[PDB]
């Protein structure tokens, strides 16, 4: 049993072959932000769980 | 769009020029507002906000 990534903005799961992305938070540097395809297209803001900094 | 619609017109406390009476009038009148004492016009109705011809002391909510 392996953990499955979850989008940071909408909280939905990430499918195997969607244009999703993940990167270290640009503000703190320890949290990992995941963005799913739909959130990325819709340009929905994400808020870091650690910093509270918000952006797209 | 707004969840709770809020009026964009206010009630104005005004001073009559001719006699100096205090009055409270609507800022979007559909008639010609007249002073209750001297019968002098105070606000001119129009398509929207009226034209006030008397001094405006206060703008109540």
């Amino acid at each position: 049993k392996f953990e499955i990534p979850v989008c940071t903005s909408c909280g939905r799961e990430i499918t195997p072959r969607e244009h999703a992305t993940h990167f270290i938070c640009p503000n703190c540097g320890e949290a990992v932000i995941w963005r799913c395809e739909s959130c990325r297209v819709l340009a929905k803001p994400y808020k870091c769980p650690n910093c509270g900094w918000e952006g797209p | 769009k707004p969840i709770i619609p809020m009026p964009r017109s206010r009630f104005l406390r005004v001073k009559c020029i001719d006699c100096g009476n205090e009055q409270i009038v609507f800022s979007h009148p559909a008639t010609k507002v007249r002073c209750l004492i001297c019968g002098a016009t105070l606000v001119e109705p129009t398509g929207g906000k009226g034209i006030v011809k008397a001094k405006i002391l206060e703008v109540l909510e």
């Binding site: - | 619609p5 809020m6 964009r8 009630f11 009055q23 009038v25 507002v33 007249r34």
Partner: protein
């Protein structure tokens, strides 16, 4: 949308959520009742009375005042008029529709070729019939009451 034109005009009134009259109201319940009866004697309709009170006397509305004679209901222009024995004999909107229908028929008698005005008259009469049905159901007028173009002149 509109009843017949099927348009979506949204112009109207946006009153703030209130439960008690604002403090800055100068007049009291009895004074506003006297003002309402005075305006009715002057000869205005209910809507025009309310508009005059809102514009000149700075009374946002009489519906914000609780009825002194009935704690279970708020005040109202029609209720005040009927309390003082001055309410319309028949509904004011129905009266206005009947009046303008009679005027339109008078014009059509001189201009029989005005088919567009005739269609307008037909729509007015449909609205009149709707109102008559509603008031029949609510018992606001005799059950045998019927709208007659001939008899409407007497009412007008």
């Amino acid at each position: 949308a509109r009843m017949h034109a099927r348009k979506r005009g949204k112009s109207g009134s946006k009153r703030p959520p209130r439960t008690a009259p604002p403090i800055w109201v100068e007049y009291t319940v009895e004074e506003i009742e006297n003002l309402v009866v005075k305006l009715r004697k002057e000869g205005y309709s209910t809507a025009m009375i309310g508009t005059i009170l809102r514009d000149q006397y700075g009374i946002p509305s009489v519906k914000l005042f609780k009825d002194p004679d009935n704690p279970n209901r708020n005040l109202t222009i029609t209720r005040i008029l009927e309390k003082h024995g001055l309410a319309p004999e028949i509904p004011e909107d129905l009266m206005f529709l009947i009046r303008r229908a009679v005027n339109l028929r008078k014009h059509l008698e001189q201009h029989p070729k005005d088919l567009h005005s005739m269609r307008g008259l037909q729509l007015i009469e449909s609205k009149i019939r709707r109102l008559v049905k509603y008031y029949k159901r609510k018992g606001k007028l005799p059950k045998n009451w019927r709208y007659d173009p001939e008899t409407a002149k007497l009412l007008v």
